[model samples]
Target chain A: MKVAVLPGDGIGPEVTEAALKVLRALDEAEGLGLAYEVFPFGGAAIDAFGEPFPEPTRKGVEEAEAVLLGSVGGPKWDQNPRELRPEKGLLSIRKQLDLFANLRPVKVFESLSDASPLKKEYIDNVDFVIVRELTGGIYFGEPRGMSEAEAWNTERYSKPEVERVARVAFEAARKRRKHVVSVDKANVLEVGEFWRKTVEEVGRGYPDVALEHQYVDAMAMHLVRSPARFDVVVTGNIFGDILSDLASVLPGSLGLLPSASLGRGTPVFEPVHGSAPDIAGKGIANPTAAILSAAMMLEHAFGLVELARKVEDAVAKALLETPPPDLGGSAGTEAFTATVLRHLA
Target chain B: MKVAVLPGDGIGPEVTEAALKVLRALDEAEGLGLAYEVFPFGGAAIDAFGEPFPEPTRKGVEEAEAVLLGSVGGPKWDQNPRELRPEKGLLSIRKQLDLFANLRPVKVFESLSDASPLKKEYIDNVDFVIVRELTGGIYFGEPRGMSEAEAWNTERYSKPEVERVARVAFEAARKRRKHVVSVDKANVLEVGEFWRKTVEEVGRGYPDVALEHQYVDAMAMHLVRSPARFDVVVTGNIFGDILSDLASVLPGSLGLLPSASLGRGTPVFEPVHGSAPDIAGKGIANPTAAILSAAMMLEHAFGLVELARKVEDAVAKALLETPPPDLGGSAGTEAFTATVLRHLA
Candidate 1:
């Protein structure tokens, strides 16, 4: 299997290099035949090749079994044209790959759970996944914007959109803890009212999965109060984007969490953390999230589940022994990679 | 000044009774020429006249100097038609009054600081108001509904719409802590980008009122993490609605928070709580929030600042002694009312 890699900007390259090392180690340890064709993408490409998502990079991502991205965009490119910005590259890739499912897993790692700003106990044992309805709602909706105040955006979803996403959440629930919490504003919205009924109808087929509903507002509160009570949370694009980022904080920081954007075309895996231009060449960027994305790529696309497990275990053990800077230790990028490799052996 | 009173539903009648008595005592002590023309409204009206918001009641609210309403809505009307339900009536009255500014005080009442589910030390001295942009955004956005498998909702904002609401927030900020935290999603959607830029530009005019922008998700986490840092929070329809409810919970249940909706027309004052039919005619509801709403009504609309202070003092004294059942006190409706009157004397 071929995995196209994009180390977009800033700390993107730092984390991407660390991830490559971990991926190679996993491939060798598990005897899983895997091939990688990394590409220069996003802002770096814009600087070198005058295009953010250069055509060659797009072609490579198009043909790969899966795509792994480090991060995208920074202050340097904040004023760039929309098409030349890193975000446009991300949106374009998702559109090209038809990647609709956004799986965001948040859990307080035992080693650094105390580092959370929240009360030590409130966030204990918090493990949950927010299954976002990507490619729809406010993000990709029409009539999006014009100026500061004159614009409008649509939050529409078709039957197929809701059904396919709902089914994905349901199937995921069947594997993990059997509980699905569908979040919406059914009380005042016809769309939400319909979503409520359809999710309820869909739940009938999977009786083992306890189905519950909560207003999106209430869901936000509950996510803070008792994250342990939840298993699968499904919501629209805007809500999902917000919730997932907030969820990332639960695991500690954006640097430690990885997310999977999977759909029709080449599946994409990326670290949830964005470009950190300030520390671009510091070689201290936390790479666990990026390396974890590689594990997901191997498991989901290449059907190499053992490799994924080994990668996760090695990363976890490495953290347990010598925490990295993001989690409060002084380990540089290479040191962290070496630690994970040693655990893999 | 005649306060239009509607002790309208479940515990609504119970709580309003206390608030009315408090107003009377304040009027007597302050030598203010004040009277009450109590009116029938809400779910009780639905039961009595088959209309939750009868024409006579609407007219009464229209003519009254300022309206004071207790909580309204309950399980009995849960099965009622969408239009006739008590909450629908509540929304309609706000629309009719053109009360677009929903002011919610997230302050921790001194006496009930321990009532917060979070630590008392962390929540002490936490005082702020969330000036919600009501009557706009997804709450009233059109083309919202569902078909067989697909459900869709529209979220739109015109330039003027956001400006007007942002003005309200800035104006509110000037009178309080002079800081406004505007929440949006500039990172993901064009609408959010517009929201961020507009608030920044609008904020440029208000030199005294400092403005900062935070994404909706980050704001959600911040609300839980640090309730003290905020002075005035402003957000669009859906976010305001949910965040307000969550803010209410910060001080405990929704039972003891008062809300005032203000705009071009007459401002409508009501409790931050919904009607609790479960305890209808139970004679045990906290009236502090309703009384506070009346105080706000006098201060904001009637321009009776001194009179409003007197009312607030009386209610605070009473609540400090012993609040009603929902706030963990044994005081019944009438006893609470008598306490407020005595405190004023």
Candidate 2:
């Protein structure tokens, strides 16, 4: 299997290197014929090549069996034009990949459960997936702009837009714990009403799925109180963008979070976090999330479940034996990478 | 002081009427000179008068010194032509009245604190205000509708739009505990960016007020985990609608929540609950919220602070002594009303 590795700007490349080391160990251990082609992405590439997401990188990622990306964006690119920003490239890949299902699993890691503001009981057993619609809603809505005088963005959704994401949520619920909570603003907004109606209509097909609906705000409250009650929560892109980050807190280490965006065929796996511009080249970045993304890549893209397990086990071993400072330990990226790689044997 | 009352649709009349009995008793009291004139509103009026908000009703509410509303909407109006729904009437009054600052105070009444889904410790100290922007954002944004093949809505906010709401939030924060968390999606949307910047800019004027910015998603999580940490939270219209409802759950009794939407002048008070269609005529609906709303009107519009205090004391006394079924008591609305009225005298 082939993987396109776009280690985006700043800590992106640093973490990507750690993830690649673990992936190599997994490949050797499982005897999987896996190969990767490294590429540039985000603001660095935009400055160097005049396009954040160059067409060649796009072509390589599209053709490759899977794509592994590290963090992107930094303070250096804050003043850049919109097209040259890191997010533009990321959004492009999602749209290009038709990656509609963004599966974000938020759970309290037993090792670092103390980091949670919630009482132990509220989050100790909390594990849930927020399936956000990546392609539609306000994130990509048209007529969006900013100016010193005024600014606005459209949060529009079509019937099919709502339908596709709802289908993903219902299906995921069936596979998991048979509970799906569709989140929307049905009482007020037009799209909310449509989104709510469409989900209820589609839910008819999934009789085995226990479906419930809550307005986004209410769901947000419920999410904090008893995140364990939810198995699958589906909402529009803008809602997902916010919810996924919120859920990231449950696991204690923002640096060790991973996410998978899937569609028609192969899926894209990446660290569900941003480039740490503050510590960009310091070598102190946590590599656990990056390595975990590689684990997800093995499982979802290369069909090497055991290799994925090996990668995960290696990361868990490092986290348990010697967690890096980014995850509240003293080890640097290289030390953690070396530890995980050693365990892959 | 004259107050316009709208016992809207479904159990709106039941709850409001019971509340009026308490108000009448207050009017008879030496210190509380409160006289109320009742009017029709919502889907019931729409069905009877051919207009969702009958012109006479709107005029009466606008001309009166203050307005108090009961719950609105039900199954009878669930399928009503969208234009003739209860929300249209409710949103219309808010827009016309210029009630831009919607203050929803979330509290766990001492009598029903144990009913919360949250742990007792979390609920024990839960007290916060969610001030929502009532007039703008998605609710009034342009290009909102449903098509034969698709549906859409817009989430547009100008600098002034967000600034006005920020000002409200800042003032509220200053009055409370001096901490304000402005909720928006600055990381993703341009409008959110403007929102965050504008809030900070406005916050500079009130140096004593601490300003914090949180993404909408993270706010949801924090609201549950540490509700006591918040003093005041401000967000857009759509966000407000959902958050207000969610915050109401903290009170433990959907039947005991009151809200006040004001904009630099006299405010509109109402129950933070719904019209119980099934129990509309059974006299089982709790009237505490409506009566409490009247207390708010007494203080905010009539300047009858002491009278408002007495009403509040009476309600608290009744709640402590005997709560309605909604709060786990066998007593119905009539009994609750009588208890409060007896205390008022």
Candidate 3:
């Protein structure tokens, strides 16, 4: 499969390189054709080509079947204009790809579970994925403008909009625990009611996955009260934005998180954490999040579930065996990456 | 002062009666001259007047200085149509009175600290108020409907709509820790940006209260991560609904929670718990939430901060001293009320 790799900025380069090291090993072992090109993006693109999302990068992204992003932005780009900033390129690429489905898996690795602030029982064995519809709903909905006296934004969803995201969630559940909880505030908003109904209709197509509905407010409480009860959660843009962020911190370690955004075009996988320029070349930064992002890319983008699990299991084992500095051990980036590679084999 | 009392359904009467007993005792002690009339509302009104929000109840609410609502709705009323349902009375009354501000005080009482699912440090001194814009924003916004293919709802806020709620939050902050965190999704939504600018304008009015802004998603994470950092949080209807409900459960004991809704007309005070029919007339159901609501009415509606603190302290002491069954103590409704009264004296 063809791939576009953007090891954007800072420690982003360090971690994405670790992910590539493991991916190459798998490619050679399985005799699978895996070809990829590293394209300029974010601060790197701006430094090299005067724009964050340069034409060559867009060309590579469009031609590729899948894309892997390391991270983006730094203090250096903070002074840049909105369009010139590294973060702008992040949004521009998503808009270009129309990456409608954002998948965030919230899993507490047993070794680092004590890092969380929650009581043990509440967070123990907590694992769930939040599927957020990114391109539609309130954020991009039209008829949105503001007057001096009044401001308004629309939360609009077409049947096709809800259907496709709902299918993504159900398809995700089929590969996991076979349960999908669609969250919406049907008790209050008309759009929420419409969202719930459309998702319900799409859920019928996935008979193997159980579907249930929850009001957003109740879901917010249930997240803290009983997070383990959830398997796959799907919601419109706004609600999902709030929920996904809340669920992400359950493990208390942001350095080990991964995310994926998919659409009709090439899918993009990346770490949920940001670029840490302060520690960029220190070799102390953790590469587990970047490797986990590669795992999601393998499972979702390429449908290589077994290989993805291999990478994930290796990550979980490596964290405990050769603990990174962030997780309270002395291992640097090179040591951690080597441990993950060892566990993968 | 004249008060309209709505002992709506199920255990509503049991708890409201307990609250009134304590209120009468305080009125006698302080000579504040408190008098109240019970109004038919919710299931009770539907049973008697064939409508959940009867004309007589509306008249009572309109004529009174304050309203004390015990609770509303039950399974029996669930089968009723949308307008005829007991829940509809709530929306109608809020609209009738134009109760644009809903106040939910999330406090973790020391006596019940062990009950929370959150670690003690996270919820230990977690005392914050959420000032939600109840009348406007997405829930009641215009240009909302659905076709067979597309569905839409507008989240519109006027300068007045945002200003009033902003002032309410500031006013609440002045009475507590002098901090207000106005939450919005300003980075993505135009309405959120407008909301932030308008709230910044309002914060200028209260020189003593420090103000800050947070995106909705970050606020959701903060609520779980460091809930004690907040003092008073204000937001539009939709964000507040999800947040208030989430914050309420942080204390883990809804049996002691209280809320108030205020506007141009009479302010209404109520408990956060539901009608709770299963335990009605069982003598074991807790009345602390109702009595706590009365305390809020004292402080906010009557400006009797001293008396409000007196009642709040009494409830806290009574929980530890007398111990209600819900709090893992043996005290019945009568016993708990008597203990609160004794503590008040």
Candidate 4:
């Protein structure tokens, strides 16, 4: 399988290196035909080509089966115009790839359950996936701009937009716990009401999967209170944007969470963390999420479930044995990567 | 002083009775001159006056010095038309009364810290108030509806709308830890950006208050992970609707939360919980939130700070003595009410 690798900026490079190290080990051990084409993105692209997402990088991504990206943006690009900023590259690439559904799976390992602020029992056995509508909803909705007296944005969703993401959630649930909780603000917002109706209609296609509805706020509380109760959860872009991040805390550090954005074409896998410029180049960035992102790529993008499990099991074993700095340990990027590789073999 | 009492529906009447019992006790003991005129509202109003919010109820609310509402809506009215629903009464009353800001204060008591899903340490000292813009934002924005295949809602915030709520937060912060964390989606939403700039402009008026900005997504995670870090939180209507409920979990049960909706006229104090039809006449519904709502009424609507503290301290004392059924103990509504009355005296 061909992969586009974008080791974007700051600690992005360090973590991506660790992920590549693990991928190479997997390739050799399993004899998997994995080939990667490295490309610059984010701040690196801006520094080298005067654009956050260069044409060459887009071409490389389009040709690949899946794309692996590290964290993007840092303080250096804070003053740049919106289009010129490193963060814009991340958005542009997702739009270019037509990645409509973002899957964020949060699982609390027994060893790291103490890292969560929640009581251990609440997160001890918590395992859930948040399927966020990535490409639509209020974030990218039209008629959005600021004015002198008033500023406005529209939150919109078509029947197709809601149906497609609902299918994604149900499909994922069928593989796991066979339950999907579609979250929205149906009682108040028109779009949310429509989204719920559309999702319910789509659920008819998957009778084997149990479906439930929850208001976004209620789900947020339930997520922190009884995360173990959920299997596969789904919501629109803005709600998902908040909830997925909220769920990211269940597994302890943001460094421990990985996400995948999938569409009709090439999917993109990335860590659920930002470029920590403060810790960049210090060799202390936790590569767990980046490596796990690769695992998601293997499973969802390549349909290699066994290979994905191998990667996931290795990371779990490594985490059980040693703690990364983000989880209050001293293991650096390379050390953590080496540990995962050792477990993989 | 005339108080409009809306003993809404289901568990609403039960909890409202508990709140009124305490108010009567205080009135007798301190000659507080509290006179309540019970007004039918929600489903009860629909049953009696053929309208969820009748003309008489609106007149009562307008003439009142303050209002105390005991939750609304139940499955019985779930299928009613939008204009006739119990929740519609809530919206109409708030709009009619011009209650523009909703203040929900979440404080984890030492006695009930174990009740929280969050680690006791994280919620040990959590005392923050969420100043939610109530009358405006997406929930009330125009150009909202469903079409043939699409649904949309507008989120529009004017400078004055944002500024008024900002001032409410800043004023709240002045009485607390002198810190205000304004939550918004500034990077993606035009309304959020406008809200942030307007809030910053208002912050300039209160030099003693320190203000900080956080993206809505980040704030959701932080509210669960480190609620004690916030003093006063301010946000738009929809975001506030979610965050306030999310924060409600920090204190463990919704029964422990009290909310106040403020505007230029009579403010309404209500519990941050709904009418649970399933548990309605069981006498098992927790009344802590309703009693606390009365306390907020004393302080905010009447400026009886000392009386409010008395009510609050009594409830805290009662909670320390025995856990309500919602908190894992067997104390019923009357039992909890008696305990609170004992502490009040």
Q: By lDDT, who's the top model here? A: 3
lDDT of each: 0.77, 0.78, 0.89, 0.88
Write out the backbone clash pairs for model 3.
none
Cα lDDT of model 2 by residue, B214-277, tens digit: 8776776666556788888999877676666556655545667778888854468998778878
| Residue-level error in angstroms, candidate 4, position B245 | 1.6
**Model 3: per-residue lDDT, tens digit, A1-345?**
788999999889999999898899889889768899999999988888998999999888888988999889888877877798899998888988878999999888888877886777888878899999988988889899989999999999999998989999999998878999999878878888888899988877889899999998999988888999999999988888899888877888667899999888889999988889889998998998888998898889889888988898898899879888887898998888888888877
lDDT of 4 by residue, B154-259 (tens): 9988898888888878887776589999999988777888988889999999999999999999999898878889999999888898898888878876578898
TM agreement with the true structure for every prediction:
0.85, 0.73, 0.96, 0.90
Interface RMSD of each: 2.8, 3.2, 0.8, 0.9
Better of 2 and 4 by lDDT: 4
DockQ of each: 0.46, 0.39, 0.84, 0.79
Task: Write one digit per residue (lDDT tens) for candidate 3, span B82-197.
Answer: 88889999989888898889999888888788788788878888889999998788888889998898989999999998999998889888877899999999999999999999
Q: True contacts preserved, each candidate?
A: 0.65, 0.68, 0.93, 0.93
- On lDDT, the stronger of 1 and 4 is 4
Q: Please tell me which model should have the higher TM-score, number 3 or number 4.
A: 3
After superposition, the stretches of candidate 4 with alpha carbons farther than 4 Å from their true spots are: A45-56, A72-85, A170-175, A201-210, A277-282, B8-14, B28-30, B39-58, B71-88, B173-177, B204-208, B274-285
* Model 2: CAPRI class: acceptable
In model 3 chain A, the worst 10-residue window by lDDT is: A246-255
**Model 3's DockQ?**
0.84
